[PDB]
């Protein structure tokens, strides 16, 4: 039903963004073995900006992680320094979910959300490039945390509304040419 | 022979592929 | 779709 529909992607779109956004400010990405505070090395929370020291001496110290401690290379650490596929992946799932609420009122366009699809999609596949960024950047034992699975979680249901989205379209059109 | 951040993004990949090709081939309602 | 769209203006 549109209704269902309509709802199932609401809900689905708020999931993605508040997701992402939680994982992109929280730090439980790689539970790994380094230092909490610099000027004995124990494990460290570490995230997308910051690292954190548990199980230490200073537990709950956190230190900005130092990205920037070959132009290739320097891409790849400014990349993911200025974690620009994360963060435009939020973005892009606000715009997406502002268009889906204006499918609401000023109804009637159709091809608003044609574009909460394209917003989801996309994305998705920041998301993707981020993920790809991230674990290349982090290779130079471990163990990946709530925040990284968080983040991916939202690649999965981003995609998912992103199909509802075009679906809803395709059968409006479908309507109108019915 | 593969690492497992490498099986985690081909299942990620095979999803967006899938996804995108659905949307590039059945949104457009002038070949419907 | 844009192209194809200007043109349903015909
Ligand atoms: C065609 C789609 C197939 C999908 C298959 C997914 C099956 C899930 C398997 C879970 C293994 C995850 C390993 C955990 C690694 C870790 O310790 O961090
Ligand atoms: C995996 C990512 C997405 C795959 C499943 C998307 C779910 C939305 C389905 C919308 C339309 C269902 C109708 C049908 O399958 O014929
Ligand atoms: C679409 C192609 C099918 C591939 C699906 C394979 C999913 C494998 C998931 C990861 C498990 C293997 C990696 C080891 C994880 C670990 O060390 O615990």
Same mark, same amino acid.
């Given at each position: 039903?549109? =209704?269902?529909?309509?709802?199932?992607?609401?809900?689905? !779109?708020?999931? !993605?963004?508040? #997701?992402? *956004?939680?994982?992109?400010?929280?730090?439980? %990405?790689?539970?790994?073995? =380094?230092? /909490?505070?610099?000027?004995? $090395? +124990?494990?460290?929370?570490? =995230?997308?900006?910051? *690292? /954190?020291?548990?199980?230490?001496?200073?537990?709950? #110290?956190?230190?900005?992680?130092?990205?920037?401690?070959?132009?290739?290379?320097?891409? &790849?650490?400014?990349?993911?320094?200025?974690?620009?596929?994360?963060?435009?992946? +939020?973005?892009?799932?606000?715009?997406?979910? &502002?268009?889906?609420?204006?499918? $609401?009122?000023?109804? *009637?366009?159709?091809?608003?959300?044609?574009?909460?699809?394209?917003?989801?999609?996309?994305? =998705? #596949?920041?998301?993707?490039?981020?993920?790809?960024?991230?674990?290349?950047?982090? !290779?130079?034992?471990?163990? @990946?945390? %709530?925040?990284?699975?968080?983040?991916? &979680?939202?690649?999965?249901?981003?995609?998912?509304?992103? +199909?509802?989205?075009?679906?809803?379209?395709?059968?409006?059109?479908?309507? #109108?040419?019915? | 022979?593969?690492? @497992?951040?490498? %099986?985690?993004?081909? +299942?990620?990949?095979?999803?967006?592929?899938?996804?995108? &090709?659905?949307?590039?081939?059945?949104?457009?309602?002038?070949? %419907? | 779709?844009?192209?194809?769209?200007?043109?349903?203006?015909?």
């Amino acid at each position: 039903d549109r =209704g269902v529909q309509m709802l199932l992607t609401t809900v689905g !779109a708020f999931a !993605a963004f508040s #997701l992402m *956004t939680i994982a992109v400010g929280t730090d439980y %990405w790689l539970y790994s073995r =380094g230092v /909490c505070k610099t000027k004995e $090395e +124990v494990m460290t929370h570490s =995230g997308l900006w910051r *690292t /954190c020291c548990l199980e230490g001496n200073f537990k709950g #110290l956190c230190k900005q992680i130092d990205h920037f401690p070959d132009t290739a290379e320097y891409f &790849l650490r400014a990349v993911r320094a200025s974690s620009i596929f994360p963060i435009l992946s +939020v973005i892009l799932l606000f715009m997406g979910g &502002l268009c889906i609420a204006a499918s $609401e009122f000023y109804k *009637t366009r159709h091809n608003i959300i044609l574009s909460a699809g394209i917003f989801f999609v996309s994305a =998705g #596949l920041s998301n993707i490039i981020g993920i790809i960024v991230y674990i290349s950047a982090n !290779a130079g034992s471990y163990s @990946y945390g %709530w925040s990284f699975y968080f983040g991916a &979680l939202s690649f999965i249901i981003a995609e998912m509304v992103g +199909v509802l989205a075009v679906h809803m379209f395709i059968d409006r059109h479908k309507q #109108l040419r019915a | 022979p593969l690492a @497992y951040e490498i %099986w985690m993004c081909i +299942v990620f990949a095979y999803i967006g592929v899938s996804v995108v &090709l659905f949307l590039v081939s059945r949104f457009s309602p002038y070949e %419907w | 779709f844009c192209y194809k769209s200007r043109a349903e203006a015909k």
